[PDB]
Amino acid sequence: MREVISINVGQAGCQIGNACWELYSLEHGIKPDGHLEDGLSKPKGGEEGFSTFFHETGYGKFVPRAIYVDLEPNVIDEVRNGPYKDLFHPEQLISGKEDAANNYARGHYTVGREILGDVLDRIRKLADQCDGLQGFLFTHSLGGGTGSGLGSLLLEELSAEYGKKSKLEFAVYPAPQVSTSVVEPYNTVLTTHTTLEHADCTFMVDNEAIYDMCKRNLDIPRPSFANLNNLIAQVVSSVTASLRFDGSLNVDLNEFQTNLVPYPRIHFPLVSYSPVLSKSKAFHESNSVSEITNACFEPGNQMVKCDPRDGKYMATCLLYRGDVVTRDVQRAVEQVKNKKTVQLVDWCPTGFKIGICYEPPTATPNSQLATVDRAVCMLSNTTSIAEAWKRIDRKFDLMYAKRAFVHWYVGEGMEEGEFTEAREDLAALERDYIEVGADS
Amino acid sequence: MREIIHISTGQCGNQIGAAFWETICGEHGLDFNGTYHGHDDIQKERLNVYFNEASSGKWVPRSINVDLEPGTIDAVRNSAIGNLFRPDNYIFGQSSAGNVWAKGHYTEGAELVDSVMDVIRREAEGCDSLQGFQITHSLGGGTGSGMGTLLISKIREEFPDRMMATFSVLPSPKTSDTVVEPYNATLSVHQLVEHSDETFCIDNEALYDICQRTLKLNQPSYGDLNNLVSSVMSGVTTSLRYPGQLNSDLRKLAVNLVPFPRLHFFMVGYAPLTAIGSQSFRSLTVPELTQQMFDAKNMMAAADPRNGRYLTVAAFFRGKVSVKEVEDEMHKVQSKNSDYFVEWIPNNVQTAVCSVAPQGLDMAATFIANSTSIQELFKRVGDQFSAMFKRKAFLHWYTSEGMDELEFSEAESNMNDLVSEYQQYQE
Numbered sequence A: 001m002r003e004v005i006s007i008n009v010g011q012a013g014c015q016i017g018n019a020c021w022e023l024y025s026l027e028h029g030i031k032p033d034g035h036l037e038d039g040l041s042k043p044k045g046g047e048e049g050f051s052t053f054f055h056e057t058g059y060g061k062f063v064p065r066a067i068y069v070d071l072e073p074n075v076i077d078e079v080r081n082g083p084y085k086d087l088f089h090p091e092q093l094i095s096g097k098e099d100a101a102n103n104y105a106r107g108h109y110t111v112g113r114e115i116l117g118d119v120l121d122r123i124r125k126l127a128d129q130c131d132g133l134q135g136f137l138f139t140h141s142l143g144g145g146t147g148s149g150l151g152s153l154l155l156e157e158l159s160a161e162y163g164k165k166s167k168l169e170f171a172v173y174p175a176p177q178v179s180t181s182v183v184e185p186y187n188t189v190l191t192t193h194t195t196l197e198h199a200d201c202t203f204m205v206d207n208e209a210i211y212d213m214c215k216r217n218l219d220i221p222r223p224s225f226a227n228l229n230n231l232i233a234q235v236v237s238s239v240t241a242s243l244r245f246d247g248s249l250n251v252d253l254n255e256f257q258t259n260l261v262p263y264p265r266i267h268f269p270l271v272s273y274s275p276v277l278s279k280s281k282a283f284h285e286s287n288s289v290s291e292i293t294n295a296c297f298e299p300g301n302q303m304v305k306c307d308p309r310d311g312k313y314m315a316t317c318l319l320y321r322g323d324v325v326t327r328d329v330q331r332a333v334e335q336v337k338n339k340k341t342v343q344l345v346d347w348c349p350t351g352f353k354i355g356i357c358y359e360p361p362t363a364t365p366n367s368q369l370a371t372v373d374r375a376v377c378m379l380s381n382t383t384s385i386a387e388a389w390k391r392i393d394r395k396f397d398l399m400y401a402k403r404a405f406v407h408w409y410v411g412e413g414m415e416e417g418e419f420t421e422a423r424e425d426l427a428a429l430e431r432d433y434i435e436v437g438a439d440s
Numbered sequence B: 001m002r003e004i005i006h007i008s009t010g011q012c013g014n015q016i017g018a019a020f021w022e023t024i025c026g027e028h029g030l031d032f033n034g035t036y037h038g039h040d041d042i043q044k045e046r047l048n049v050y051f052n053e054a055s056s057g058k059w060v061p062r063s064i065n066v067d068l069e070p071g072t073i074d075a076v077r078n079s080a081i082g083n084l085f086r087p088d089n090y091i092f093g094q095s096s097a098g099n100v101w102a103k104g105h106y107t108e109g110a111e112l113v114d115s116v117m118d119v120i121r122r123e124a125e126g127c128d129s130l131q132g133f134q135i136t137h138s139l140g141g142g143t144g145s146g147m148g149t150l151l152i153s154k155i156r157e158e159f160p161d162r163m164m165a166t167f168s169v170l171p172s173p174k175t176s177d178t179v180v181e182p183y184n185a186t187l188s189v190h191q192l193v194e195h196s197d198e199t200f201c202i203d204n205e206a207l208y209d210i211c212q213r214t215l216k217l218n219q220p221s222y223g224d225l226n227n228l229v230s231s232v233m234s235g236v237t238t239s240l241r242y243p244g245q246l247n248s249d250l251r252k253l254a255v256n257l258v259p260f261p262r263l264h265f266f267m268v269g270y271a272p273l274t275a276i277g278s279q280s281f282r283s284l285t286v287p288e289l290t291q292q293m294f295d296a297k298n299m300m301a302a303a304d305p306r307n308g309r310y311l312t313v314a315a316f317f318r319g320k321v322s323v324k325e326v327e328d329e330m331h332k333v334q335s336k337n338s339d340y341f342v343e344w345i346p347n348n349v350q351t352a353v354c355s356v357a358p359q360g361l362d363m364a365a366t367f368i369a370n371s372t373s374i375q376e377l378f379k380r381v382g383d384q385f386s387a388m389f390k391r392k393a394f395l396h397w398y399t400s401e402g403m404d405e406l407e408f409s410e411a412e413s414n415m416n417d418l419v420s421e422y423q424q425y426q427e
């Protein structure tokens, strides 16, 4: 397989996407204008990959196969007036006009549907240019309904359009202890139904967890979404790494379906990432993959507000970048299993997909996380996850019991029965998800 | 959307409007003669929010000043701040309303209603980005409560989907300017909640306190009080006027700030209050703003919110402000003062970081919430509405217009129901 198309929906999605494209161009030596610069090696720009992310240009002005979708012009305008203006085809920046507000009843429907014809045709033209097209990569938020509801519709449309390509979805979740939007539980819960039934693999990221890491591991006195997003971008780039670069143990995008997903459902891995070192520490620091591997299980590097120690082990994946010995990571894994934390359920009985990419990690100048010669990305279906669902479901319950804000959705294309059903599906997942671990 | 019409009505509307544009034009820089002074992208790519690029690059705001007293506009177009407004927007006529809610529109005021809709209709067509209608008047004012309230119903028919923001000024239940101030306020709410979507509570009496307590001003004046209200009107728009980490919107307010329909009254609160002379010995930081926003002394409604109970608060920080600086401070208030916030929300916080900063300061922040103590402001008007008119005094002035006694009774029953809405929904 070869191609992958990136889709950003809503502001948060777009902001994260910005970071990713900055990063990808960094990794391949591509300048802010594209063209080229140079583009280069083996496999810097390409040799393949690219083309994987960037579309070949007969001029060298490589073009990111990314589509930006928003209902608010302001966000995309930021992009259009940023330094990476020249990395996007202008017709891939699908500006809206009247916002869906906050939002889902408008986002997945009365407003969102008015631009999907353009969005889908944009995608179709792009997809026709592509070979293989192993998957789509969604980036968005489950807070505001554009990222949630519009993103949801688009996802669904592509599962209907193709239904056979990998549907990745990096979704930002509400922090369990704090958020910026009062009706967020409705905007989140109302879409759990569709991400469940239309994404093949979702990633769950909490801003709060990352902010903790920034304040603590990176010593940041005043965190910013820019920094937060840079971290996320790096995680995304590793998924991914062996689809572009040479590796000892290459990982197909579909590899995760094969290794992390045991049932049709359950496809919600946690991510974790290390080393996360501030530039001030990366002198005293100097270590093996065994230590980095340990840090991946440490709660402090989880990027999600849950307790992995409480949860039990389901399949997991350890992707490594840079100067890594395959023997050493096997040794490291063995040691980790012997910790008896995240109790390995019988159903695996062990299931550590090891991915080894030769390409060293890199950080853009906007991150104060020190560059390293090796790094680790961890994915996991650990049973701790249903607690996040429980948390948001309680918020949903309190509100829904009084209805209150229900008004804003029902009054514009919705039904209370829909809210009921969304809740039911979420509840069903909490139950099933627990049962497959609960059995042993 | 971005293009929003700022309608003005009432003796206080033009006053607050003159100070409003005086502050808006100072942010992005725009001389009263209509000259461009932006620097540059952020002060040029968002100039159509209220102005129009006419010939010769002459920018003019979109405001329809209307009033039955021609003697008021004479003290605006003649003095400073006049070239901006277009003479075709002026709609004034003799004689006046008479400081009554009936004649303000039910009879004499019904003559200019046909002219106001004509100008607002033509501007709506040319503006390919309408969203709502910002109105500023007094709840008990003559032309403000009468002609201003009826205008909201007319615009609601031709613009139902569009929003409707209003900045009504509540009366002072202690130092009233006119004895017929509470009576006119009882009839304004009869149709306000039945058309408008959001209304902010403002009380002049609550401003004299902060002006003499924080600002340290001995003899306030109407010219200074309008500046405080201008800071609030200019605060709930920076997200739409300038970019930011979390750009809010007038629509997002009702989706969160308004839990159930029958609840459009809000409690404003601008901060920090720059004290004249004592501003250099301060440290403009987010933790310092949180202590002032939730301070009951800074409220402009201004019923004590501590005695009641909050519902959905909202902040709009500006300038050099991060994300955790607000999420942390605002979260601490939800713990130590959890008794004042209700649990079924449950999260009682809403942020909206901007990008630019107001002129003269490095950072600012407003406060908007729905407290259960707002009912107290209605009880003062309800008691005076019945206790004073129990013997049928000063009532022949209104019945002579055409309104019957039954019409005035239905207005009191509605307000009495609103007080019960804050208990269902227990306090």
Ligand SMILES: Nc1nc2c(ncn2[C@@H]2O[C@H](COP(=O)(O)OP(=O)(O)OP(=O)(O)O)[C@@H](O)[C@H]2O)c(=O)[nH]1
Binding pocket: A009, A010, A011, A012, A013, A015, A016, A071, A099, A100, A101, A102, A103, A107, A140, A141, A142, A143, A144, A145, A146, A147, A148, A172, A173, A174, A175, A179, A180, A181, A207, A225, A226, A228, A229, A232, B246
């Ligand atoms: N990591 C990260 N999280 C973000 C970023 N921007 C926003 N978020 C989070 O995503 C959610 C915000 O979604 P919004 O920006 O309100 O909305 P939206 O999803 O872009 O779509 P609309 O509601 O229609 O505007 C909150 O939970 C934020 O904490 C970002 O740049 N990075």
Ligand SMILES: Nc1nc2c(ncn2[C@@H]2O[C@H](COP(=O)(O)OP(=O)(O)O)[C@@H](O)[C@H]2O)c(=O)[nH]1
Binding pocket: B009, B010, B011, B012, B013, B015, B016, B097, B099, B137, B138, B140, B141, B142, B143, B144, B145, B169, B170, B171, B172, B177, B204, B222, B225, B226, B229
């Ligand atoms: N903040 C503020 N209040 C005002 C101004 N002018 C009048 N008011 C208030 O408005 C009320 C009187 O209504 P008024 O505006 O004269 O009504 P109208 O002119 O007949 O529509 C009183 O409570 C005043 O304190 C002003 O310029 N600023």
Ligand SMILES: [Mg+2]
Binding pocket: A010, A011, A012, A072, A075, A144, A146
């Ligand atoms: Mg947005």
